[PDB]
Every structure is written in C-alpha cells, then in structure tokens.
Point group: C2
Chain length 137, copies 2
C-alpha cells in the first residue's frame, strides 16, 4: 500500500528564542555537523506524532506549539524520499551533542554559509518569516 | 562528488527555471539549472557550461553562494550554488522574480536544492533591486 518513505525535520525554539541544535557524527564526513532535529517517520505514524517523538528522543524536548512548513525532496534526482519540516515553539528541555544557541547567532551562521547541512539550512530559511513576525528573531 | 546549481536571472528581473522529469518522483517538477562537475573542470566553468547546455543561457555576471551537503547522513556529495545575472537566452520557463519567490514561499518549488539556492540568493536580488 503505497506511501513513500518520509522523515520529519524539526527546528526547536525555546520561550527564550534559542534554537535547539545537535552536532551529530556523520559517517560520510567522518566528522560531526550542526543539524536541526530529524528522524524517519514510522509505519503507523502520523507526521505530528513522529515529530514529537523525535524531539523527545533526540534532545529531550517538548513543544508548546507546532507550525508545519513546506515539505521538500532532498535529492529528487536519485530518491523519492520527502522531508517534512516543522517549527516547534515554546520548547522545554529536561554520537549526538545538544547545542543551544540564540536565534540571532544561528541566522548569522546561516547567512555566512556556516550551516552546510542542506535540509537544516532550508528549514531555517523557511521558518525565518514566522520567527521574525513573532519577534523571536 | 560535486554538482553545480545555477539560478539564472535576466536584466529584466526574470528567472529562468526548468520543468524536468524526475524518475524517482514519476513527476516533472520545477527546478533551477543544475548539473554535475566534470573531472578537469572548476566550478565557474561547469556553471557556465551547464547554463548553456540546459537553457541556452549566457550570463554577464556571477555571484557564488554557500556550498551545502544535500544529504550528509547518506552521502558526502556537495552542491555548489551560484546566482547568474544579466542572463540572455527540458522545458524552459521564464517568470518574474516576484512570482518565483511567491512559488518558493508557497511550497511550489519541491526540489530542496533549488529552493535552498533561491533562499540563499534572495538578499543579493533584493540588494540589487531585482526583487
């Protein structure tokens, strides 16, 4: 029964306007790289539910509000996978290293090219209008 | 392991986008110009070649943009985007920037690498008053 593979990407932002990032070792780099939260969506999993699960499991986070952002294909030339980005707000926090930075610094990094992870960079760009409107950025 | 992505913009402030069939998607989708970089090629050269081959285009000016891994969990490939300006001229499509950036924001550009390229180039287009 066709539903293609899916992963959810979450930009988690605290009440204080900090992004919750991770530095995750990636084998094709033999190095770590700065990323937002992400993971595959399970068989019987709704997008909303995969997102909360991943936020909990990867950074020990929970969100007060979820804002869905436009889905995209990370590599449509070789793969049918779809990445679904979400902005998580009001986030509280109880291989991978968690990295909490003020949003102004994250967007300075973004503009400078220092965020080389494509899916994370695209999510940050898509969330930017929302964060500016709320005065978080 | 390198590819070059090109956003082509005309002196009139129109972007030149493509409609391309993508077999993993069983759909044709809106993209910018992109192609793989050959062995004895540097990035500028490849971008100009690929612009010519794909949309019949030639640019008066180039603004490089930041490189990115499309999928570092899985691949070490790097994509290198460039904005091409004063462009003059596999379905090719020409649109006013204002419409292209409406499409970007709406989610109508489904290809992540093209979208990121568009986002990365937006400050420059604004700076220049093309957008």
């Amino acid at each position: 029964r066709p539903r293609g593979p899916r992963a959810v990407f979450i930009l988690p932002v605290t009440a204080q306007g900090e992004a919750v990032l991770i530095r995750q070792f990636r084998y094709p780099l033999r190095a770590t790289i700065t990323e937002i939260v992400a993971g595959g969506v399970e068989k019987g999993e709704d997008l909303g539910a995969a997102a909360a699960r991943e936020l909990l499991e990867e950074v020990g986070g929970a969100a007060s509000e979820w804002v869905p952002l436009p889905g995209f294909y990370p590599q449509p030339s070789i793969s049918g996978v779809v990445f679904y980005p979400l902005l998580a707000l009001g986030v509280t926090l109880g291989t991978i290293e968690r990295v909490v930075l003020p949003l102004a610094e994250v967007y300075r990094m973004l503009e400078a090219g220092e965020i080389q992870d494509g899916p994370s960079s695209l999510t940050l760009w898509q969330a930017r209008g929302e964060l500016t409107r709320r005065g978080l950025l």
